[PDB]
Amino acid sequence: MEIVQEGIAKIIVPEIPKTVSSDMPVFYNPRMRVNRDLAVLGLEYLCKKLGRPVKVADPLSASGIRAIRFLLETSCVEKAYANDISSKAIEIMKENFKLNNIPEDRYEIHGMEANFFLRKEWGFGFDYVDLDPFGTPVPFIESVALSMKRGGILSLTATDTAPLSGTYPKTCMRRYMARPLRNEFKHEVGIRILIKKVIELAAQYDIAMIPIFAYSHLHYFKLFFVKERGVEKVDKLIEQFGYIQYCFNCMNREVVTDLYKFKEKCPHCGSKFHIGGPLWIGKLWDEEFTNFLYEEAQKREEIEKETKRILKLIKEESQLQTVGFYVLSKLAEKVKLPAQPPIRIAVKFFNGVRTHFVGDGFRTNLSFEEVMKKMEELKEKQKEFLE
Amino acid sequence: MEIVQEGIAKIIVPEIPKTVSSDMPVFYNPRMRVNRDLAVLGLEYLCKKLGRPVKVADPLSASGIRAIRFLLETSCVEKAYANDISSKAIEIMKENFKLNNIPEDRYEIHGMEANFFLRKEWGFGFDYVDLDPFGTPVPFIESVALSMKRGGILSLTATDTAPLSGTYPKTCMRRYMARPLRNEFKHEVGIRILIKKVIELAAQYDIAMIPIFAYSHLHYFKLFFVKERGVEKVDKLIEQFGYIQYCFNCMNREVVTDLYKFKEKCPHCGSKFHIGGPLWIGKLWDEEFTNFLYEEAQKREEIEKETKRILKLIKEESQLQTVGFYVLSKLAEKVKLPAQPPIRIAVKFFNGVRTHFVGDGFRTNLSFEEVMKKMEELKEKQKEFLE
Ligand SMILES: C[S@@+](CC[C@H](N)C(=O)[O-])C[C@H]1O[C@@H](n2cnc3c(N)ncnc32)[C@H](O)[C@@H]1O
Ligand SMILES: C[S@@+](CC[C@H](N)C(=O)[O-])C[C@H]1O[C@@H](n2cnc3c(N)ncnc32)[C@H](O)[C@@H]1O
Ligand SMILES: [Zn+2]
Ligand SMILES: [Zn+2]
Incomplete structure (x- = not known):
């Protein structure tokens, strides 16, 4: 119904309402531009890191924009594997791949359920996987972790920020097994909860999903993980699970990793000292990865100015992590x-x-x-x- | 290599060593007899409960003994769906089904990976599923929960009792996200941890897996769950997650569901008060279900005497649960x-x-x-x- 351009890519998508939310449940959302920019840069990082052709996966492709931008805007993509259970998503994907003059042997299109698609006997592991679902990414985490290759990177998105941010605590408890905190830094608490969930799900298979980047905007979270192996690496991650005691009256807060150390009353004003977690209390950003994203972004004219400003602010933020x-x-x-x-x-x-x-x-x-x-x-x- | 009889079933299996462990990793283990007896009785319960033909699943079938005993020893099995990724397991299964004169339209044999088998678009949900893996059942829990029909029953087995019992605490933490207690009731702690894991995995999808029976013998745990729907039922289960403070010096113990209430020192002798969990602190046995198992078992001559003695002791135990x-x-x-x-x-x-x-x-x-x-x-x- 409408042709749009993002980066180097041109795609056909159904017409979009005059205005949309950041998490708008539509075939293609231009407000997710920054998100896809980060994904592209993240892949380019892996390209520079491995120095070889890589295989990337797009389990929830929709229009196929991400897989396409990967092929067009990065240097090391050997073959892109895009998938979507929707029929017209498939049709549109086909036409979009052809529209961008992408050689057939550069990509594969599938119409399977994400988990089936990822758990296929490929004979290889994915170096890069972009998981971009409507709502929670939980249902796909395990399949993604198993399908990924060692040293591979996961580009993750979650739009169920409401429960994670404390708006729906019981819903948050059921899905993430954690108590959220609806405070001034509720979005960080939510991200840290999501990280903890991702790590524990992968930990079930002795897989270490190390968080290397976090970004929160409006109604969506953006996370980057690198897959590693070895029970010791999984253990080091688990050791970085903890709780956050917070006081709504005076805003006092403290990190608690020792179950014996919980305080009922806020040491400052004596009000109730609430408990958030368990969650990830480790670093939210890998300095090297973040710095690359920023520097590589500055070299690309097809990268949004907003993405560049955000990356500059996040770089500044990553040097004093709390x-x-x-x-x-x-x-x-x-x-x-x-x-x-x-x-x-x-x-x-x-x-x-x-x-x-x-x-x-x-x-x-x-x-x-x-x-x-x-x-x-x-x-x-x-x-x-x-x- | 050898023909054996269990209950009403006759099966062909590879020859077995003179002696075997309770969790012996072999094609067919006769020491799991009691386990399969319970499974049969559990299915018969569902038969009496639903009063209609049911569809049962055997994702990890091996010899196909369970699916066969289900067809032969229960009254309501419409069709049995057995599966195994092993080729000779398939071959042996085929021959075993034919050996017991089971009509072809009474069963289906598949050679898929358990999760793929369960997540198939069947057009129906399984009323009864028996999950019997070597080691942990974790990798199959979600697929089982999703594949099951509302009100259906899960017959579960776990042989990774060592980590759950506290012998390998770090391994237990990675897989079940809980601290085990290697004490005199370590086996109960392990079971309660396993239950908590099963519930939280299903809770991710707003599915309520209610525990109705627990049995520990040597190196294997036996659990029964009933699938229910509704976030309120999942919440009621989550509320029954907690911790167990235990003292190794004098054996003092206390249940803690409030994070604020942990004690560093044992109130009795002052020694270190260790923390086990989080885990299931609810009931381990549903009185009605347990009573049926015992009564129905007494009516069957093909049920082991041991199974009957165990069920009598468990019935006695279920009337004072702690x-x-x-x-x-x-x-x-x-x-x-x-x-x-x-x-x-x-x-x-x-x-x-x-x-x-x-x-x-x-x-x-x-x-x-x-x-x-x-x-x-x-x-x-x-x-x-x-x-
Ligand atoms: C949020 S959209 C992602 C759009 C695209 N990744 C982008 O960045 O613009 C998710 C898509 O995944 C598809 N999808 C949802 N559930 C799926 C499932 N269980 N298996 C396979 N695809 C699924 C939906 O059709 C939907 O179009
Ligand atoms: C512990 S045996 C179960 C035997 C049988 N259920 C019984 O009670 O005697 C588990 C079987 O599942 C099969 N299996 C293991 N992993 C599997 C997987 N990932 N997918 C499908 N089958 C699997 C193995 O071949 C093995 O024979
Ligand atoms: Zn205060
Ligand atoms: Zn003591």
Whole structure:
């Protein structure tokens, strides 16, 4: 019904409403542009890492845009294996592959259920897999992990952020076996929960799915994993499962990996100290991988400017990684700060960095008490220099 | 190589070593007789419950003994679907089905990978599924749950009892995400961990796998589940996940479902209070289901005498269900009891019942302190009446 261009690719897709949500359940969503940009860059990383032709998988292909962009915008794709259980998805995929002048022997199209497609006896493992489902990726995790080759990378997407973010706690518990926290850094909590789920599902088969990148935007999470083998690597991941105690009254938070160490009352104001998790308390970004994404993105004109700005902010953020973060407006609302300095400036007072999660959010190695102390200080010297 | 008879069935199987373990990794193991007896009785229960023809599945069939015994020893089996990825397993299966004069339209034989076999578009759900793998059943749980029909029953077996029982804690953590306890009731802890794993895997799809029967013998666990639907039923199951704090010094134990309530030191002697779980702290036996198994077993001459004795002991045990149990010899060794009365008699002093888990084990509603008090009393009045 409509032809659109994304990057180097041209595709035929059904017409799209005047406006769409970030997680719009449609055949093709242009608002997922950044997501697909990251996927392309992620594959190019693997290309530079392996230095050889790779086989990539697109189990939930829809229009086939990702597989196509992989073939056109990267250098090492030997063959792309795209799949979709939908018939017209198949038809549209066929026509899109031909529309982009892609040689037949460069790709395969399948109309199987994702898990069947992945668990096929290929005789080889996928170097790169992009899992982009409507809602939760849980039903496909195990099949993906098993189908992937050692050292391979998983490009993952999840749009069921509502349960993960604490809006639907019971739903979150059933699917991810964890208690979410609907706070100012709820999106990070959700991501860390998703990561924990992915790791434990793969851990069942002694497969180590190491998280190397995380990105949250509106109603979708974007994750990157690298598959490794060995029970010791799985163990090292499990050791990085933990809990987050959070206080809704004063926003105090602490990481707990020892079951004996839970506190009922918030040490600061004495309010209820809620428990989030279990979840991933490790690093959200691999410095090298993130840095590559940013540098490689700057070399590509077909990469969205937004993707580049996001990658710059995430690079800055990855150099000071913490569990949870602070939101300036929430802190200021707590201490009634006379004037709120721009977040770029505000972070300096806390020796911290900006976070992509929230506009006025920031990470810092300072303790909660130290942060509040900084707020009071800034508050006092602002009132003091105001006569 | 050898023909053997079990129940009403006659089968051809490769010759078996003079002696075998309970979990012997062989084509056919006669030591699993009791297990298959329970499976048959379990199916007959469903027959009496539904009152209609049912479709049963045997994803890991091997010799095809289970599917055959189902067809021959129950009344409601419409069609049996047996499967095995092994070629000679297939060949042997074919010949065994024909050997027992089973009509072709009464069964189907497949040579697919279990998950593929179960996830096939059958156009119907299985009323009864028997999962009997070498080692852990984890890799098949989700496929089984999805393939089963609402109200259907799962006949499950697990031979990886070593990790579940605490012999290999790190291995247990990777596969079941839980800390085992290598104590006197380690086998119950293992079963409860397995149950928790099964429930959470099915919970991912809003499927409620309710445990209705548990049996531990040597190096294998036997479980029965009934599939139900609705998020509320899944929630009620999740609420029954918990932890077991245990003390290796004095054998004190307590159930903890509240993360805030963990104790570092054993309240009795002050030694380290270890933590087992998370795991299933609910009932291990459905009274009605268990009672049927016992009564129906007594009507069948082709059912092992051992199976009948076990079912009688388990029926007795199911009327006083607790989390964990006590072992007389261990308690006596702690207080140095002059003479140990037979377990049948000993249980009376504690107002408890015998447990199938261990010969001299027993369950009781008395608190740990009360139990030890009983031991000292019995000890004193035994020494007192001894002049
Ligand atoms: C969220 S869309 C992904 C679109 C595409 N990956 C992109 O980036 O634009 C997911 C697609 O997977 C297909 N799908 C959903 N469930 C599936 C399943 N169980 N097996 C195979 N394909 C499935 C649907 O038809 C849907 O079009
Ligand atoms: C433990 S034996 C079960 C024997 C039989 N159920 C009984 O009670 O005597 C498991 C069988 O499943 C088969 N099997 C193992 N892995 C499989 C898989 N991934 N897919 C299909 N069959 C499998 C093996 O060939 C093996 O013979
Ligand atoms: Zn507080
Ligand atoms: Zn103690």
